[PDB]
Design a protein around this nucleic acid. Structure first.
Lengths: 470, 470, 470
RNA sequence: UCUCUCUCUCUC
RNA sequence: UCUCUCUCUC
């Protein structure tokens, strides 16, 4: 059933919106100041710093960074008669802990935490990607496309684990491998056992993320190494560059600004009654009647800022620019010529130059965002019946495909990673930049609610550039 | 997290400083005597000898060099009413081993030991470059800029592996290749196993140090030779010659003399609380308020000696003279016209001519020392995405940059080294000596603590000479 | 490390000394008979006839030369109450081989074979220059200074190949290419395959011994010729004419008379304990208290013979007469006015004519025979830093000397040998006969052991002639 | 080398 | 070939 999930997510976002309402009440902010992204951003880093129970425990025993008992940051932006001023107001964690506890009807609301931290990961991926760490581990900077959910720490649950990219897991596992290579950390002690456990948890997350059997089997065999040394490093680099084309089925969770939920809840649009969804039309129509104000530099233009905000909201920074333009209806400028900077404001920037203005989030069309892969993999390896089920009692042979059943069970088990790298190479050669994917699905219009009739897009606009970076 | 590494480095430097305080207590030296470079050098080389297990174990089975059961060296210099005296005082290994034992709260302090070996590597690289071994191996002494950490023994760990450079690894590999050519050391004995293990580990370190893909793949094809003969000899020479321009980001650890650390520790500046960094402003901020004395010959210029010792402390002997002078604030004299000699003093030179004086270490500016390479390599090979991820479920093509996809995989595996020499010489031809590097970075002022605003240098002083040697 | 090398050196020279002692044992010779250079010469020639496995294997299948089953030569001289007698005593190979086996504790002592062959090469080069070979090859007899180690056979190892001079290598290359011109030996048979491996190895030695890179390139381009004809003949000729001034650092190994080692070992001076070297003070310190007797014709000058024996022992046949006179302390007579003959005695000369007399070997000073070249080549082509190592991350250009790095790679590969001949000619024009050498090295006094202080010689005796030949 | 291998972010 | 052309080095 899907009604229960819809009711749960509706209750969750209703609690989130009511917490936004109460923060607006408590902060004594104006109507316009309650529609600013910066305030929600700072408040949500406060949120994560209050539920980072692991870091709370680590910092209680580590009283450093000067005045840091329980309070961090808090750069609240306020308006005086047109001009803007930032105040470093410090809030302790504990009162906000109870205000959450009262905001979710006595519950902890950790799922909402996962969605906000994922949405921060989405905005981080949209704004800046780290080739710095990517080459710190030595991996080439060609794979910036697989840094989805990179900023997400381990503390998130399964829902958070679903949206993290393959490359994020590759980076996280290489960090552990390099740490275990630097020092003899895999001893029979509890630390070794726990890092072992986290390792297989991250690995079965990985093998769940993939779709084709060959990469799942080679991930299975990578596990067989009890002592991760140097060979596994290139083994999993080969895994990553294979996932470049044999991409993993990674979800795209549609989270929206802290305010958008608050404005919707304040108007009385209860999500429990009519139901809510995270993949369907819902986050699209809530943005159809949402007003958002933002802060812009004297050199920054708002036109690219609105598009970057739409990137951050819908996590489409790693998608084709042409498709995003089609749903937008306007051309989406790649990051090469974006005359803008990061959304977050540096702590040293002056305030006389800063100017606030609206953001455009209206889109002409809407589309479903499933956690599936391109149809090209199914074209390379088709599907269908593998055996037959006897129905009538008639003397006959029972057909069964031996060369497929034996290959599924791998009667002669693979010896190392290179033998499967051979099929990786032949699949890559079979792959083409022409194979059309997502057959049977299309882009839909706003006026339709039940997914009745789509329109098939068709682009012949040469080589405008389907690459957000470079 | 960076707090844990900061605490660890602060702890081990505090241990080193309080060991130096213990040495100053036990040696019964005056206040000026503990501000001498020479006595710190003597005690520090003594520590190197005491903690070097391999040479020791080679020595108790080899009772040679006359008086050598367990005591070596020890030329302690003492000021006698203005004059100086040198005494050859001999110390046991176990006593000072245990003095370290409580000098670090029961730990081995391997990281501190690596710090001392690295600081020795910097002093040797600043004073004398080993053209002699280069010509011995037939290797051109034009490339002394590849001799980072040549005096380092192989006992240094991963932290020590970070600092030892590409050309030094070429030299040590050439040594082992010459040894294996002289005699058949490649048999199936345990010696052959340890040789191949060391050889593959050192090749892994090499492939870690390089940046461009072509050199990495050529090195990966280097160790395919199970029986290294003569071809890999010129292969490695050409590796060094190509790494001349495509340099590897090895390391430039800013190690400081034990006297400076001891003076800071004695004053009560505990490093654990406020933190320590070896790469940022921190190793710099101790030096503008540091007093250092040293002995000088009646012909040596103290002004040159201060510049040379600041070079050795900051390991800037292979850095360009223009920027080194800009950061220092005064012109730096190249090795050609230095009216000074090595900071180490000969054991046979007379006692009368030595004169002590203060060493100038204060510098006008500061800069961060990143372990990276010039931007010119990224100019030759640009940056950007290679793959895309489907965010919306739309029936569309998945753009893949196929010709670079083969390039990463090398579908047609390289036949030999020569095909790689071809395009690497092509890249060398594409290189220009006017390529500005390190974009987006600059030199900051001492009043800056958080790296808020740098100033970009601009050198138009003709051809003063960006070559410390020659 | 050098301790193991000195220990091994002491080991095999101690074995050789004990072998000579036991020769004195079962030869039933007197004390004076054990101090005769020619007895050592004859015994050691019988030894080489015993240890020439290739020559033996060529010999048993060819039973010629009358009484030659296993016994060759053996002209032993004995004193009969003042007079002299010569007897042709024949010994087998196997018992001598077994005595060597028992003399080096069951080892083959191939290093001793190499050293004895090197001593023979120095003796023959000092005595007679085979200008007949030069005229047969057509190479002019003014190049006899490049005849170092001509008598050496191919069977010598890497140490034996080290002393072999450039001219001798050119000679066997001319011989082999002439043989390849006479008949079609370059066919696909195994003989041609061993031919090409030998030719390539000799070319590797050729590129090894020189110092300047342009000749490396020229000799490498000589080697690529799959069919060496008359052009490569001329190429090697020009290589010799270039190597006259661009001398290769071949070797100057100082091997000495077996009688001297036997006398030293018999006295109880163990070389393994105190260490021994073939380049340092050791060969100098043993000869100051060594007595050697030799046979002299009724016309031969004993004063000339002592000097010739000392020069042959120290391998100064191609050195400077003036420097030899300085190191010896007395004037060295050139070959033009030597009133002596070859050390070895002809088999037909009568026994009544020659008389025994002492040989003077003591020298006033001692020096070091380094395996390097004159400083003039480094004056023509200097040394220094060519590339810059970025230490501090600063927005700057990273200089690299393009006109030198490109010249190192030779981006436009050399067309033929003539283009390199052109730069050889211009370097010859830049060459001068007044280029001083030993800038920092000098001749030392005997009383010093640890290489403390030199005296720089100054020769102003006009034009006595620094030419041992002519 | 998590005190910055490039597109810049106080955010660990 | 560790006792060392090269700018010093126990």
């Amino acid at each position: 059933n899907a009604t229960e999930i819809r009711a749960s997510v509706g209750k969750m976002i209703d609690g989130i919106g009511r917490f936004y309402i109460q923060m607006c009440t408590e902060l004594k902010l104006s109507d316009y100041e309650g529609r600013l992204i910066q305030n929600s951003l700072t408040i949500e880093r406060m949120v994560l710093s209050a539920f980072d129970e692991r870091r709370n425990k680590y910092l209680e025993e580590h009283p450093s960074a000067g005045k840091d008992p329980k309070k961090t940051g808090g750069p609240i932006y306020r308006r005086v008669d047109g001009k803007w001023r930032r105040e470093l107001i410090l809030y302790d964690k504990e009162e906000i802990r109870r205000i959450w506890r009262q905001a979710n009807n006595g519950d902890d609301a950790t799922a909402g935490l996962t969605h906000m931290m994922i949405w921060h990961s989405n905005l981080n991926d949209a704004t800046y990607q780290r080739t710095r760490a990517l080459v710190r581990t030595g991996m080439d900077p060609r794979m910036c496309s697989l840094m989805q959910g990179s900023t997400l720490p381990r503390r998130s649950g399964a829902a958070g684990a679903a949206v993290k990219g393959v490359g994020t897991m590759v980076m996280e596992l290489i960090r552990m491998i390099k740490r275990g290579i630097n020092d003899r950390n895999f001893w029979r002690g509890e630390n070794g056992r726990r890092t072992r456990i986290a390792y297989e948890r991250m690995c079965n997350i990985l093998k769940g993320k993939f779709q084709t059997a060959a990469q799942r089997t080679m991930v299975d065999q990578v596990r067989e190494s009890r002592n991760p040394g140097n060979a596994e490093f290139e083994d999993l680099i080969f895994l990553a560059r294979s996932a470049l084309i044999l991409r993993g089925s990674v979800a795209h969770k549609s989270c929206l600004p802290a305010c958008v939920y608050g404005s919707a809840v304040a108007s009385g649009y209860d999500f429990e009654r009519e139901g809510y969804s995270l993949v369907g039309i819902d986050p699209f129509r809530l943005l159809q009647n949402s007003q958002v104000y933002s802060l812009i530099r004297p050199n920054e233009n708002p036109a690219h800022k609105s598009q970057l905000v739409w990137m951050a909201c819908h996590s489409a920074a790693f998608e084709d620019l042409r498709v995003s333009s089609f749903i937008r209806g306007t051309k989406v400028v790649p990051r090469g010529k974006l005359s803008t900077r990061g959304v977050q404001i540096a702590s040293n920037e002056n305030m006389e130059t800063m100017e606030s203005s609206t953001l455009e989030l209206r889109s002409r069309y809407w589309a479903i965002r499933t956690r599936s892969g391109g149809n090209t993999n199914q074209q390379r390896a088709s599907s269908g019946q593998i055996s037959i089920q006897p129905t009538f009692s008639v003397q006959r042979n029972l057909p069964f495909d031996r060369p497929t059943i034996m290959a599924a069970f791998t009667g002669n088990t693979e010896g190392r990673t290179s033998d499967m790298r051979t099929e990786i190479i032949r699949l890559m050669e079979s792959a083409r930049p022409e194979d059309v994917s997502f057959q049977g699905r299309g882009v839909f219009e706003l006026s339709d609610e039940k997914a009745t009739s789509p329109i098939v897009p068709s682009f012949d606009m040469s080589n405008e550039g389907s690459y957000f970076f470079g």
